[PDB]
Amino acid sequence: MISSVCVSSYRGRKSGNKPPSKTCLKEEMA
């Protein structure tokens, strides 16, 4: 695997669409 932090370094490494301003992930979990 790739040594990363809590996240698995997956394509959705945008921070995830939080409850407000869902623009971080904006890529179906990728």
Side-chain angles (χ1 to χ4, degrees):
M1 253 298 277
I2 289 300
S3 293
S4 303
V5 80
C6 286
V7 190
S8 184
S9 263
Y10 77 133
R11 250 266 274 178
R13 269 245 272 171
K14 329 305 232 285
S15 189
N17 267 15
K18 279 252 282 258
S21 232
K22 272 102 160 181
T23 285
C24 287
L25 244 180
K26 68 149 265 271
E27 266 157 86
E28 59 174 270
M29 209 69 148

